[PDB]
């Protein structure tokens, strides 16, 4: 489908009502696959952190660590899918501008890969954009094929704003993910049992970043 149609007919209205949004076989299979290739020859040549510091023991040797991350800018050699990905990311955005909320997205963050190395870690509860650092909105791509939750786990749940129930997410290969980044979405990825990739990148709202600079 057109970026166009999937933004107007889809995203579009389903973000204001929804402010959650999945879209699934966004790329296709070649082109998920060459982005899985390109984020795991990342990984195999320790282009990644060593994963954040989950548990600090006395003794240092039995430290426990969760996430890799590592930023991309789309350009770098041997990223040029990723960067592909993202200019597909922005195109979409781009057709969906004065459309999505009152916002008027008007720049991005560069890409973070995340890694979850599935020793049992994830991610505490959070907020993305909590203090009004002008990210609006946040698009995570996954590339896991096969990915069954019921037995790697790594399930992202979101907590709708004032919704009871939360919205678990897996992190199917080729989705593609949007949601607000506010407290409206307070979310967490629960424990991962198997190596876990995901792509994200967070849009500025022009008039939240303007004002941002001045409280920094
Ligand atoms: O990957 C997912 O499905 C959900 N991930 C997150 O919500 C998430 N959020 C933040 Cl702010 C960070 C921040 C740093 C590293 C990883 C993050 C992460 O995976
Ligand atoms: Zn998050």
Redesign the pocket.
Known sequence: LPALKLALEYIVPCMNKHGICVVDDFLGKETGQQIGDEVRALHDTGKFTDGQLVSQKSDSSKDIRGDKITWIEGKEPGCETIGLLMSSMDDLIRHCNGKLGSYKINGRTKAMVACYPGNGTG?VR?V?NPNGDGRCV?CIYYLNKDWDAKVSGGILRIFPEGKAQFADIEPKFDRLLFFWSDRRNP?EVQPAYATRYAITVWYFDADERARAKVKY
């Open positions: 991610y959070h993305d946040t979310h």
